[PDB]
């Protein structure tokens, strides 16, 4: 997660206003992964 | 496991100062 403001110092602060001044830039970003693994032992024909 | 203790709730701290609230793991 990450954010960017510019603002004008003064103005930007007010939180009634606030967003009429300054400029934002949110970024948020997953990445899930797993790997798995299935072994099947086959040793007749049968099964194979 | 004290010093992580420590370090853990000294870094949770900072995830205590959008930027809504963190999580923590499985201590």
């Given at each position: 997660?990450?954010?960017?403001?510019?603002?004008?110092?003064?103005?930007?602060?007010?939180?009634?206003?606030?967003?009429?001044?300054?400029?934002?830039?949110?970024?948020?970003?997953?990445?899930?992964?797993?790997?798995?693994?299935?072994?099947?032992?086959?040793?007749?024909?049968?099964?194979? | 496991?004290?010093?992580?203790?420590?370090?853990?709730?000294?870094?949770?701290?900072?995830?205590?100062?959008?930027?809504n609230a963190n999580?923590?793991?499985?201590?």
């Amino acid at each position: 997660v990450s954010q960017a403001e510019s603002k004008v110092p003064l103005l930007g602060d007010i939180p009634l206003l606030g967003r009429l001044f300054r400029s934002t830039k949110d970024t948020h970003t997953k990445r899930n992964l797993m790997v798995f693994l299935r072994p099947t032992v086959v040793r007749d024909s049968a099964g194979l | 496991a004290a010093l992580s203790g420590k370090k853990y709730s000294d870094i949770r701290v900072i995830d205590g100062t959008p930027t809504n609230a963190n999580q923590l793991f499985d201590g």
